[PDB]
């Protein structure tokens, strides 16, 4: 039932998901002047050479590229994390307008879009057990700005016409998520939550400082997707982002001096 519209959108999620007013909700604004360098953060390790994408799907809120997480084929390690986190899916949030779209902000600056690579902690049995624990998920967040085209994104963009509406899916093999990374993996990290219902506070957030650059042509294809199912009145899939939430007692740690 929840969405991003006037009445089912983020400002009303708390009616059905009371955790929405919890102590470590995401996203948050990253105040660069308050986020301290932490020299105990170990280097961020990403092992994606054996990543096995399976399918792409429009679930009515975003589109998800799903991966085989049955073994350590595509794992995140290091940084603030203890243990091994398996990539399960990635998706985007974007705006109707280049000036908005990102979930996290940096000194209140909004980016045009935000990519989330979602991983879960093999400490737990599976995704379902991991989401129920404060140390269960690690989400790598990567800002998008409008500029030159992102070649590693073109394979995703080139299949969006086949998943225009909610419920549609398609096979989507051999996608290399490495092609979505920026040059620097300098990042900020803090403990937080899912940014969509059920909004569980199970996420170690790792937000990269350097955005990737995508083309107008590429984001205009994002904005052509539909929230609605085929045959229902069109609602364009745009502004599917949750705004910054209160930071409360939390500190953002920076990985760079
Ligand atoms: Zn997300």
Author numbering: 4 to 260
What text appears in the publication on this structure?
Crystallization was attempted for all foldamer–HCAII complexes. In the case of 2·HCAII, 3·HCAII, 16·HCAII and 20·HCAII, single crystals suitable for X-ray diffraction analysis were obtained and the solid state structures were elucidated in the P21212 space group at a resolution of 1.4, 2.1, 1.6, and 2.1 Å, respectively. For the four structures, crystallization conditions were similar to that of 2·HCAII, and so were the unit cells and packing arrangements. In contrast, Po4 was identified as a sizeable (158 Å3) cavity nearby P10. The structure of 3·HCAII then validated that the phenethyl side chain of Q5Ph10 filled Po4 as predicted by computations. The methylene carbon atom linked to the quinoline ring was found at 3.9 Å from a methyl group of Leu203, and one carbon atom of the phenyl ring lies within 3.5 Å from the nitrogen atom of Pro137. In this structure, Lys24 was again visible in the electron density map, but in a conformation where hydrogen bonding to QAsp13 is not established, different from the structure of 2·HCAII. Of note, in all structures, QAsp13 is involved in a salt bridge with a lysine (Lys80) belonging to another HCAII molecule of the crystal lattice as part of the intercomplex contacts. Altogether, the solid state structures validate the predictions made by computations.
